[PDB]
Amino acid sequence: TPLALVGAKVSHIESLDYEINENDLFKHDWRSRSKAQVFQYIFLKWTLACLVGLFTGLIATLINLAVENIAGYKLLAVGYYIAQDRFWTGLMVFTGANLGLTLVATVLVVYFAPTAAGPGIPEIKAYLNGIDTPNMFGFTTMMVKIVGSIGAVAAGLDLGKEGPLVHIGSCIASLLGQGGPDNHRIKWRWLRYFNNDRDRRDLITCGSASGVCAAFRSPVGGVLFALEEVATWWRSALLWRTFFSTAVVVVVLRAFIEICNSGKCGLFGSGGLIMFDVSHVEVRYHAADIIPVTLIGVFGGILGSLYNHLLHKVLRLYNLINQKGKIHKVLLSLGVSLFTSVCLFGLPFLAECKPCKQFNCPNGYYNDLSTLLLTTNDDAVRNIFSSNTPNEFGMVSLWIFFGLYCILGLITFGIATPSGLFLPIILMGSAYGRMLGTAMGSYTNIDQGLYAVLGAASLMAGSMRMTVSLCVIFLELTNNLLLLPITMFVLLIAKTVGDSFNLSIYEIILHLKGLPFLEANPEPWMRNLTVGELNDAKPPVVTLNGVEKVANIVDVLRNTTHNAFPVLDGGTELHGLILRAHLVKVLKKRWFLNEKRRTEEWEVREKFTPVELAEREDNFDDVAITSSEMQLYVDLHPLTNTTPYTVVQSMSVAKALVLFRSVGLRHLLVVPKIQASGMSPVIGILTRQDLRAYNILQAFPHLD
Amino acid sequence: TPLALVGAKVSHIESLDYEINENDLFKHDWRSRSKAQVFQYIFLKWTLACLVGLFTGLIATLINLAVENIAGYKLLAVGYYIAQDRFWTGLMVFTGANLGLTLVATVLVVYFAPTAAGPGIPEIKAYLNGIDTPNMFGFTTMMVKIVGSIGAVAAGLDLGKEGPLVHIGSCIASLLGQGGPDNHRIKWRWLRYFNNDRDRRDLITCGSASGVCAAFRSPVGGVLFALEEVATWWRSALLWRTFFSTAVVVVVLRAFIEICNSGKCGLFGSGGLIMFDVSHVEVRYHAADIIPVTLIGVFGGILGSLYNHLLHKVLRLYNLINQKGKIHKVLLSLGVSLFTSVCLFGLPFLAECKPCKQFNCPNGYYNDLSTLLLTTNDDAVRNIFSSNTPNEFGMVSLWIFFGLYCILGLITFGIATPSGLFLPIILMGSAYGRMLGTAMGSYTNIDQGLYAVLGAASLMAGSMRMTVSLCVIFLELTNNLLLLPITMFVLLIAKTVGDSFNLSIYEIILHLKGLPFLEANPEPWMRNLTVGELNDAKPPVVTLNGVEKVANIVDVLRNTTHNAFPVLDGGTELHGLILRAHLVKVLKKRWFLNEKRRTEEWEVREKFTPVELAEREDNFDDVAITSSEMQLYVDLHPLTNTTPYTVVQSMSVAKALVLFRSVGLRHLLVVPKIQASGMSPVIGILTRQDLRAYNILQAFPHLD
Ligand SMILES: CCCCCCCC(=O)OC[C@H](COP(=O)(O)O[C@@H]1[C@H](O)[C@H](O)[C@@H](OP(=O)(O)O)[C@H](OP(=O)(O)O)[C@H]1O)OC(=O)CCCCCCC
Ligand SMILES: CCCCCCCC(=O)OC[C@H](COP(=O)(O)O[C@@H]1[C@H](O)[C@H](O)[C@@H](OP(=O)(O)O)[C@H](OP(=O)(O)O)[C@H]1O)OC(=O)CCCCCCC
Ligand SMILES: Nc1ncnc2c1ncn2[C@@H]1O[C@H](COP(=O)(O)OP(=O)(O)OP(=O)(O)O)[C@@H](O)[C@H]1O
Ligand SMILES: Nc1ncnc2c1ncn2[C@@H]1O[C@H](COP(=O)(O)OP(=O)(O)OP(=O)(O)O)[C@@H](O)[C@H]1O
Ligand SMILES: [Cl-]
Ligand SMILES: [Cl-]
Ligand SMILES: [Cl-]
Ligand SMILES: [Cl-]
Ligand SMILES: [Cl-]
Ligand SMILES: [Cl-]
Ligand SMILES: [Mg+2]
Ligand SMILES: [Mg+2]
C-alpha cells in the first residue's frame, strides 16, 4: 500500500533513487568529471555545510530570543494583576494570551502546512532510510515550523523547540541544495552537482545534526545523534562534514550568548536550555549510593516503557479526531491549551508556603510550586537541575509537578502544533530524580540537582532507547566530562529495562504513520523462505523491449503505477532497467523513430544533456500523443541502467533484504537459476514493500 | 599473491568468513536458538565487554606504573654521578641502562613474537577489514608486547605506549572469546556462541577501542577512533557495547590515579600522559590571532606530509636490513638506542643557561634543554603543554628539541620493538607550536601552552588524517569542551593541506606490508570494465558435484589452494558453495557412502554437531585415505551454503566491489546472463584479490 502519514497528512509514498547509472550520459559519478569541476563540487560541498550550520545557529537564536520575550512580557501582564490581588483577572489574561498564541500556531499548521505538526524526527528518520516523504522540506513548511514553535513554547504548552529544530535544519539544507524555494530556484550552474538523492541524503544528514546541536549546544552529541538514530547509511567522509556543520552552530550560539549576557538583547536576553550554567563538581563515590542510583535507572526504564505504552494509545485516539476534519484539529489544540493554562495557574493554590516568588500567601512565605509552574519550561528545568539548593522544593509540591507533566506530556504530543519530546521527558525525568534525591536526605552526598540530571537522562533512555548520543548530550549540557561513568550507568539500566517491555517511541510513531521503514536485520523465519516463493504470490513482471513502440510505453504509463521496467529483446537478452521518469522524458522530447533502428552514441547527446536528465519536474497527463505518433519507435538503450543488482530464484528473503539495505536499492531483479533456453531472463522485481516483515506475514501467515 | 607482512613477519594471507550459512545444522543465527540460549549469549556478550575494559585498564596502569619506576630510578643513578661532577660516568650509566632495556625489548620480539613489532594498528585495521592476519592475537604475542613496551619507553626511545595499548586490548578480547590461550582453552560450553568470525570482529572492535581509551583517558574518543579509522563494518548495537567497554577503562584509570596521588604507589606514583592536569581556561577570541592559528594548521599539513614522505623512505630501507637475518634486526634496535642516548645527553651541553634542573652550569642558572631531553617523554609533553609559563623555554633550545625529535621520529619507528606513532608526533607537534607562540610574543593573548596543544593536534591531522576522533581525544585530554572550535579549525586545514600531497600514514604502512585492504569506493575506470571481462583473464572454475567421489575431493585439496568450490550436478543445477574447511571434516570423520545415494536429514546430525562444525583446528596432510576409500562417495549437500551471493556476467567491477564490501563477502559467484540450455550455471568466482585496483591495473594496464 502506497499510503502513509507524513506529519498530519495522509500522502502517497514512493522510494528514493540512490543507485548510480554508470552510463557517461548521466554523469552520476563525480570522479569522472573534469579536474576543474571536481574542485567546484568540493568547494560547494563545504560551503553548503558551513551555510547549514550558520543558518541553523542564527535561526535557533531568533527562536530563543523571541520565545522568552513573548513569554517574558506575558508573565509581566499576569504579574501586574496578581500584585493588585486580582487573581481572577490574572487567570483570564494568562489563559487568553496562551489561547491566542496557540491559535496562531495551530491555524498555520492545519491550513497552510500540515506536515509541520510534531517533532519531524520520525520523518527525517524515514527520509534517510530511503522513503520519499512528500511536502517535508519546503519553504512554507519551514516558516510554519519556525513561527508555530515561537507561538507554542511561549504559550506554556508542554513541548520544546528541541524537536522542531532538527526539522528546521533539515529544511535549510534542502533549500540550499536547490537554490531556494521550489518555484523560486536560482539557476546557478554549479548547483547541478547536488540534484540527486545521494547528495540530498548527505545535506539533510548535516542539517538534522545541526538541529540537535542548536538545541543542546552539543557539537559532538549532534553528530552522534544522526549516526546512531536518524541516518541509515554512513561513511567517514560524511562524518567530518557533519562535525564541521555542528561546530559552526556552537560558534554562533556562544557568540550570541556573550552578547545577551551583557544586557544588550533586552531585559529578557538570557535564554533557556542552552543557558545552563550548573556543573556538578566533585561527585563523591560513596558506596551507599549504589541503591539510589540503580533505582534511578530502574524507574527510568519502567516509566519510560509505561509512557511509550500510554502515548501509543493517546496517538491512536488523536488519529480519530484528526480525521473528523480541519476544524476538529483546531479545537483539539485549543482544548489542550485551555486545560494547560488552568492547571498551571490553579495548582499552586494547593501548595504549601515555605518561610523566607510570593504567590497567594503573605510576605515571609514564598510558594515553591509557583517557581516551577508559572515560569517558562526551560527556566523550570534549571531550577530542578540547580546545585547547592538542598531542600528548595518540598516533597508534596514535587509530586504535583511530576503528576501534572505526566498528564501534560501525554496530551500535548500529537496536537496540530510543532511539538517535541525531549523537554516533556526532561521535565518528567527531573521531577522523580529530585524526589528520589530528597527522600534519601542526609544518607547521601550526591547533590539533589545531580539526581535530577540522572533522572532526566534515565527517562529519555527508557523511552527513546538511544544511549551513546544521550550520554554526550548530557555531558556537553553540564560541561562536565567526569560525569560520564555515572551517566552511562543509568542509561545502561534504563535501556535494558525499557527494551524488555516494548519498542522505542520513534519505532512506535513510525508504525502508527505506516511509513515503510526497513530494519537492519532479517527475522529468523526469513531464512526459511526464498525469493522465488515470494514472486509466486504477486502478478507477473511488466517489461519493455529495447526498441519499443510508443503505444507500449504509453500503455505501461497509464495502466500501471510501477516506477521501473526491465528492458528485454524477446535466447532473449536482459538489457537492464529503465525508470518511469526517463520514459516520460522521451515522450515529452518526442525523440521518435520511423523504423526499428537502434541509434548511435551521438544521437542521444543532441537531445539530452546531463542537467535535464536529472530533473524530475515532469508529469505524464500533460503529454499529448496523437495516433500518428503511437506507431513510431523509441530507442530505450541509451537511457537504460544496464547494470542492476540481481539475485537468483533460490536466494532467501533474509539475504536479499541484507543486499537491499546495505547498497541502498529501490528495485532488485530476480534472474532464473534454472538455466534453460527459451526462458525469460527476469522472473521478478523486489521492492521495499516486498521485503517488509509486516507484508510477508500477511501473504504467508504460517511463519510466525 | 597470498604473501604479505604481518608485524615484522612475512606470512600467508587468507580472508575471514563473515557470511552466514542458513542451514539449521550450523546454527549461525543466534535468533534461531532457544529462549534460554539467547539469554546466555546476551549475558556473555556484556560480561566479555566488561572484562575487556577491566583488563585493558588494569594492564595500562601496570605499564604506566612500571615505566616511570624503571626510568625514575635510572635517572637517579645518572643523577648520582652528575652531582659529583662526573659526566663521563653518568653518560655510560645512562647509555648502558638504555642499551640493556632496549636489548630485553628487542630480543623478545625477534626471537619469540615477531608480530609484536610496531604499533599493531595497521594490522587491526586489516583484520577488521576481513584479512586473516596470522599470529596477531596470541598469548605470547600479548606478553611480548607488554614487556617489550615497558623496556622500550623506559629506555628513552622516541615511542609511546599509546600505539601498543590498542593491540594489547585486541589481544585481551581475542583470548577471552576462546577461553584462554590456543592450546590451553577452557571448554566451557557457553563459549561456543563466540567461535565465529562475526563475533570475533565484535570483540576485537571493543578491545581496540579500549586501548585508545586507556592511552588518552578518552572514553568517547576511543569509540570514535574505532568507528572512523579502525573498523570497516559498524552498527548501533556494536556502538553501545564498545562505549560500555571504554567507560570501564576510565573507571579503572581514575581509581588508580586517586591511589597514586596519595603517595601509596611509591615516590614515582604519579604517571604520564593520562596525568595531564592543564586545562587552558578563558581562551579569548582576539581578531589578530587569525594569522598564527591558520599557520598552525598550514604547517601541520606541510610537515605532516613531509613526515609521511620521509617515513615511507626509511621503512623501505629498514625492510632491506630486516631481511638480512635475525641478528641484523637486533643490531638496528641497539644502534638506534645508542644514537638516542648520546643525543639526549650531549645536546644539553650546547644550550644556554637562564637565570634562576641545574645541568653543567653553576647555581643561579638552570638548563632549559635538560628539562625536556633528560626526562621521560610523557613528562616532556606536560612541560611544553604547561600554561602560565610565558617564556620558560628559549627559542634556540626549542629548535634543538624540534630538530632532534624530527630525526628520532623517523628512525625509531620501524625497529624490531613495540613502537608507536602518537607520542613522536605529539612531541614534534608541540615543539613548533610553542615556537610559533613564542615568536608572536606580546602580540597575542592565546597561551603558549595552548599553541603547543594546537600544534600537536595539527601534526597528527597532517600525518594520520583522522579528524573527528582527534578532536574529542584532545578535548578529553585537556578536559575543556570549550576548546572545540579552535581545535577543529586547525584539524580542518591540516587534513586539507595534507590530503593534497600524499596519503595517511596508515595507508602507507598497509601498502608497504602488502596487506590486501579493500577500499570503500571504486575507481572511475572500474565502471567501464565488467565482471565477465575479468573472468576471461583467469583460469576456469574448479567445481564439485553434489554427491562426489572421494578421489575428486582429494584431488582439489592437494592440487589447488582455493577455499571454496561451487557445487553442481552436471540442465545442470547450481547447488551453492562448499568451503575447504568442511571438505577436510568429512574426510577426517570418514562419512563415506557405498553407492551414489543422497542422504536424509537425520544422517548428518549423528555425525556432526554445530560445535565441531565451527572448529577449524584440522589439517589435511594428517588425513590418510587408502585406495579402498577413494572409490566411495560423500554427500556434500548438508554442508553446502545453498544461498551464496551472485552477480551476472554483465555487472561492472565497480558495482561488484560495492556488493563485496557492504555485505562482507569472501567469495562471489558469477552466473550467466546468456540464458541458454546446456550451460554451466557458474562461470566465475570473485575474491578479494580479483577486486583490488592494484591487481586489475596489472592485468588490464590500459585503464589508468
Ligand atoms: C575553514 C574551512 C575548511 C573547509 C575546507 C576543508 C576541506 C576538506 O577538509 O576536505 C579536503 C578535500 C576532501 O573533501 P571531502 O572530504 O569532502 O571528499 C571526500 C574525499 O575526497 C575522500 O577521499 C573520498 O573518498 P574516496 O577517496 O573516494 O574513498 C570521498 O568520496 P565519497 O565517499 O563522498 O564518495 C569524498 O567525499 O580534499 C582536498 O584536498 C580538496 C582541496 C580543496 C578544498 C577547498 C575547500 C574550500
Ligand atoms: C551494569 C551492566 C549493564 C549491562 C547490561 C546491559 C544489557 C543491554 O544493554 O542490552 C539489553 C539487551 C540487548 O542486548 P544487545 O544490545 O547486545 O543486543 C542487540 C539487540 O538485541 C538488538 O535488538 C539487535 O538488533 P535487531 O533487533 O536484530 O535489529 C542486535 O542484533 P545484532 O545487530 O547484533 O545482530 C543485538 O546485538 O536487551 C535485553 O533486554 C536483554 C536483557 C538481558 C540482559 C542481561 C545483561 C547481563
Ligand atoms: N516493473 C514491474 N512489473 C511488475 N511488478 C512490479 C514492477 N515494479 C514493481 N512491481 C511490484 O509491484 C508492487 C507495488 O510496487 P510499486 O508499484 O509501488 O513499485 P515502485 O513504485 O517502483 O516501488 P517504490 O514504491 O518502492 O518506489 C511491488 O510489490 C513490486 O514488487
Ligand atoms: N573454486 C575456485 N575455482 C577456480 N578459481 C578460484 C576458486 N576460488 C578462487 N579462485 C580464484 O583463484 C585466485 C586465487 O584465490 P585463492 O586461491 O587465494 O582463493 P581463496 O583462498 O578462497 O581466497 P582468499 O585468499 O580471499 O580467502 C583468485 O583470483 C580467485 O578468483
Ligand atoms: Cl513527526
Ligand atoms: Cl522538544
Ligand atoms: Cl522526538
Ligand atoms: Cl604495525
Ligand atoms: Cl605511541
Ligand atoms: Cl599508529
Ligand atoms: Mg510505488
Ligand atoms: Mg587463499
Residue numbers in the entry:
A (entry chain B), B (entry chain A): 42 to 397, 415 to 628, 634 to 767
Task: Show passages lifted from the paper.
Chloride channels (CLCs) transport anion across membrane to regulate ion homeostasis and acidification of intracellular organelles, and are divided into anion channels and anion/proton antiporters. Arabidopsis thaliana CLCa (AtCLCa) transporter localizes to the tonoplast which imports NO3− and to a less extent Cl− from cytoplasm. One molecule of ATP and one molecule of PI(4,5)P2 are found binding with each protomer in both structures.
Moreover, a β-hairpin structure comprised of residues 44–53 is observed in front of the N-terminal loop in each AtCLCa-Cl− protomer, hence, the N-terminal domain (NTD) of AtCLCa is constituted by the β-hairpin, the αA helix and the connecting loop. In the AtCLCa-Cl− structure, αI–J loop covers the ion transport pathway like a lid from the luminal side, whereas in the AtCLCa-NO3− structure, αI–J loop moves away from the ion transport pathway and leaves the ion transport pathway open to the lumen. In the AtCLCa-Cl− structure, three conserved Cl−-binding sites are well-preserved. The Cl− in Scen is coordinated by the side chain of Tyr564 on helix αS and main-chain nitrogen of Leu479 on helix αO. The β-hairpin of NTD, firstly identified in our structure, is located below the TMD and occupies the cytoplasmic entrance of the anion transport pathway in each AtCLCa-Cl− protomer. Two small side-chain residues Gly48 and Ala49 constitute the turn of the β-hairpin, and form hydrogen-bonding interactions with the side chains of Glu164 from αD, Lys571 from helix αS and Lys370 from helix αK.
